[PDB]
Amino acid sequence: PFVEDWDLVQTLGEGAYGEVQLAVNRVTEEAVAVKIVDMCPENIKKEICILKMLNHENVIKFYGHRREGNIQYLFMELASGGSLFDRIEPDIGMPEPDAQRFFHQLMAGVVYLHGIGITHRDIKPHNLLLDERDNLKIADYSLATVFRYNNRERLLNKMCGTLPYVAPELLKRREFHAEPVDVWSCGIVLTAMLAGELPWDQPSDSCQEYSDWKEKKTYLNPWKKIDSAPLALLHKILVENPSARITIPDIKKDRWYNKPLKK
Numbered sequence: 579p580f581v582e583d584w585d586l587v588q589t590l591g592e593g594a595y596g597e598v599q600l601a602v603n604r605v606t607e608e609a610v611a612v613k614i615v616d617m618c619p620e621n622i623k624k625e626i627c628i629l630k631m632l633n634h635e636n637v638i639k640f641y642g643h644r645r646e647g648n649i650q651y652l653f654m655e656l657a658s659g660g661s662l663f664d665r666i667e668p669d670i671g672m673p674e675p676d677a678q679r680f681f682h683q684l685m686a687g688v689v690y691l692h693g694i695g696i697t698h699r700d701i702k703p704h705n706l707l708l709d710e711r712d713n714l715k716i717a718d719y720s721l722a723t724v725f726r727y728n729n730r731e732r733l734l735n736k737m738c739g740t741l742p743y744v745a746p747e748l749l750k751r752r753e754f755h756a757e758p759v760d761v762w763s764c765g766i767v768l769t770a771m772l773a774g775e776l777p778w779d780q781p782s783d784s785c786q787e788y789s790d791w792k793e794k795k796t797y798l799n800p801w802k803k804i805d806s807a808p809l810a811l812l813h814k815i816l817v818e819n820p821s822a823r824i825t826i827p828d829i830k831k832d833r834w835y836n837k838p839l840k841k
């Protein structure tokens with residue numbers, strides 16, 4: 579399999595829309611990631627438009643796109659370190675200094691996206707990739723949308739994301755602000771990094787694990803595996819009411835966020 583001067587050597591991933599392949603240029607040996615999409619045309623039009631805007635060290639770089647009939651090829655920066663998902667040990671997590679470093683980088687990427695009026699809407703460890711120097715890069719803009727245009731905020735109403743990562747207001751409100759939704763998903767990623775376990779299948783009324791958290795039953799898993807300092811931050815992020823939820827400027831003032839750590 580090939581595209582112009584690129585050979586598609588290895589399947590890096592498969593999902594909701596197509597497949598991601600390792601593309602090696604036959605001449606130069608440059609290795610990039612290629613997203614292959616069958617057909618949706620209005621969806622990829624929006625996606626390419628968002629991808630062309632992205633210019634930040636913690637966000638995946640877009641190189642260009644090629645169309646071969648009904649097949650779209652999206653050329654992007656390769657993340658040679660793979661996914662954050664594969665750095666999380668099930669039921670353990672990872673060393674707290676590594677989690678803190680990845681969390682600072684995630685915040686840097688999210689601040690950038692929010693600053694250009696883009697919401698990711700599917701922040702999770704499978705979408706958080708690592709470069710050669712273990713730097714976090716926010717990937718996959720297939721669900722990404724404009725929430726601010728001409729300095730005017732637009733409320734969202736679409737159901738999207740991944741249930742264990744979604745904010746409770748998506749399930750309970752007709753319309754909601756984009757930024758607290760991405761902040762909430764970052765809090766679930768932090769939980770996964772520190773405990774190697776997700777706290778609930780979804781933050782709904784019927785979910786006992788979610789009710790346990792709202793009742794402050796932190797003697798339960800995954801919370802009992804987390805140190806008091808990052809746990810205090812999680813208590814400010816995983817707040818049911820999005821208007822009461824901590825914002826990224828205040829996360830940057832948090833005690834754990836600013837706590838010196840080393841393995």
Ligand SMILES: Cn1cc(-c2cccc(C(=O)Nc3cc(N4CC[C@H](C(C)(C)O)C4)cnc3C(F)(F)F)n2)cn1
Binds near residue numbers: 600660707
């Ligand atoms: C859904 N989506 C993904 C992307 C996306 C955009 C840019 C870049 C990547 C990417 O590098 N993906 C990747 C890489 C790797 N590895 C493992 C070995 C490999 C090597 C040879 C050691 O370098 C790097 C693993 N998984 C993935 C990923 F993400 F699951 F696909 N994916 C856009 N939508």
